[PDB]
Amino acid sequence: LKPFERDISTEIYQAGSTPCNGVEGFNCYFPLQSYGFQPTNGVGYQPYRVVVLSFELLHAP
Amino acid sequence: DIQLTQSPDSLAVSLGERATINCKSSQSVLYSSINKNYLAWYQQKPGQPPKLLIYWASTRESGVPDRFSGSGSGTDFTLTISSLQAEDVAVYYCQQYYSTPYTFGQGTKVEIKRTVAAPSVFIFPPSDEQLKSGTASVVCLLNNFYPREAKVQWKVDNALQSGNSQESVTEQDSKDSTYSLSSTLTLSKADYEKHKVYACEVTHQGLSSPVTKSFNRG
Amino acid sequence: DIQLTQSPDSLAVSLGERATINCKSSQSVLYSSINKNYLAWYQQKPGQPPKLLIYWASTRESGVPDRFSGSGSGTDFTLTISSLQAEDVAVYYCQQYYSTPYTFGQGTKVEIKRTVAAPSVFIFPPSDEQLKSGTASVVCLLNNFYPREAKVQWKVDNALQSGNSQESVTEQDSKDSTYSLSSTLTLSKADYEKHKVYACEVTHQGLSSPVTKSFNRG
């Protein structure tokens, strides 16, 4: 990804020379995959909320 | 990875005169996003931790008096003291904080300047105690001399001695800026039984004629 | 760092006969202080974790029956089953535990032995469903044949086919030690429209004359 580019798509990734036409078969996966969150789970696999402040300065401040 | 350079190393100016110190960087340290030079100037007084003076090479930290100004661009930066006072004698460091590691400057020592003075010379022979141990030591004392452009030559039977002496120069006296140089000669008992005339001869710029202080063995 | 070797790989003996398995080490694994060979023998049954059998290459773990004995010295070690029974068919591993890392043996498969048998052959053509997809598959089935020294040749219009077949041999039947081999041929529709006589011909040691099973296209 080029810096700060949001690519929201639900295509079927062609991981091999199989033209599978969106059937999610052998050698064709689905890019999005869920997160498993449980309270009785380790610190490493927990949900951290994040906010990224970005300051820029060009003209008309 | 980006070494710095400063100049001049030691600068002497009078009270109330300007003072310019130059810092040179290997590569430009300009951040594209904010267009701000990344370089800072630090002041250190003898015996204390350094203090921030200028950051971004143009802005002053809170409480710093106006006298201190910072300028420059590209790779060349300078710190200018419009009028020096009695509190600014110190060592100044230029540091770049663009990318780790943070290199530092060599350090510039700022000292004040006075009119030429002439040094009253002294000479002390070794005591009775020094003799017993086996290593006699004679000493010659320049006092209250400005500036440090001078040279002490020892004299034994009209023959110069080299490679057997040390020199201890003191730091500038605060009340009046005068130095004090002690030259010491360490010689064994054999080199003491050598002759009869031990002398210190001093050459200094202000003093028109090199001075001589001799003490007879007896 | 000290690789091991075992022999033989597959051994077939009758019920109640002796069984000798040999493990060879690159260097002697004898601990000087206690003078004990460091090498162990493990038993693994299909579908379960291995079990310790012999440690120090001479002592038996608690509960192991006397039948299992371990001997050897220097670099050569052997495991002897004085009389084999119906429960010992399994894979045996020799491991050295002198210094890390702990290398393992290749593994020896112990199976029982029976008298020669003759395989009743079968032949199945592809169904109507196989045809529609585009990849017909014919299969030939050997059943209840001991020993596994045999070979299946497909026959199309008196011309041999090579490189288009697979072979699936089953594991020894527990109640009676007889195998069952399935040879399958995968051919496209074009290779099915090829001719008219599809046959499986089997050669086996016990069977005096190679057998033939053919089915006419119709």
Add this chain to the structure above:
Amino acid sequence: QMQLVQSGTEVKKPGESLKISCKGSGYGFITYWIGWVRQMPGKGLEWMGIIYPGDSETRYSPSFQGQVTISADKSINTAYLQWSSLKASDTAIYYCAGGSGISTPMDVWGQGTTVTVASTKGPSVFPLAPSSKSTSGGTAALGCLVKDYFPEPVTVSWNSGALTSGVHTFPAVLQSSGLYSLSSVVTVPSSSLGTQTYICNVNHKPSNTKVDKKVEPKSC
């Protein structure tokens, strides 16, 4: 003798992060050096690493050095084997085994946890017809042929488990496409051919495909 209980079976897509736990229960667990061993399908064991719970001294093997990370948690008596990014070649069964000291044979073995890394493709089951001209006083064979199913395993049960004698199930063989094939065949005397009905039940759980397919004798 303190027994070791393993965490369980995990199926993961390529590119994920995987943590496997070995739990140690029993008295005397003050000196057990935990070790890990991996068995690839139908192959010999290959020792991977050894860690002392507590002090956490960790010794690895040259082949696996740095591929995986072995850590231990002393308070609850556990050992963790972690993959940062598991590939598609990591499908195998892993056993945690605990020795009593350094230079001691491993005697207590945990059950073991299989790992599968792949994309599910369901099974096309096709039934072979029993040859029309067969031994009338003897027997003939019939069975259904599972094809193009990924990955292993497929369970083939005959007549809801009623029939069990002479049922040959053959291990899957991977052909060029990758998708393994498998044939299960039963032998039936030519007397029960007319009356007894044949239904093979193919279960492929990863693809959640449960099919009940009748076996039909084909005639003119």
Add this chain to the structure above:
Amino acid sequence: QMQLVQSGTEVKKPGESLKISCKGSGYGFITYWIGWVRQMPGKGLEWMGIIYPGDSETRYSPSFQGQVTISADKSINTAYLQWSSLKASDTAIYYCAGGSGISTPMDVWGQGTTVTVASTKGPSVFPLAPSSKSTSGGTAALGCLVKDYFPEPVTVSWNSGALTSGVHTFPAVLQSSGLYSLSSVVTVPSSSLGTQTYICNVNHKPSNTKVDKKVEPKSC
């Protein structure tokens, strides 16, 4: 602005292990990247390393990479600089300084802790006699000469601190033996020579040597 307080001064023999603490006190200490700097005697500063308390991301300098270890403890807001085996070249003063972010000038500086690594040798103090023929209406000089004292520093106090005008103390210069020498001289007019007594007090604390030596005018 949160101030940093340093642990204190330690004197160690060669071959030991040394831990130095930087303590951070004050509000707002959620983003201060602690850094360490070493000043060798009478030389310029040389930056060593920077650690974020908490996350513990640690960036080093190429020269010092791996010589020392910088660690942080988040609960009590402290930073530790540790030597596994300090040599005899580590005598210097160390300052911990805290920036507010990466690529930010360091503005809050701790007092700093000196480290000395050496074997104590006591000072031989010998008093020079003031020359007999001197300026009667003017002045003449007298002082005592400390020799063979290791390591620095030696405190020379004149007449229990009563005399302070014209007292020149010269920095120690190391000659071949290693043991630095030092001379302190006072200037006295030839009127007070007869009556006022001179006692130089040499204090070398590492060797615990406190000496009071009179200065004597030598005559025939």
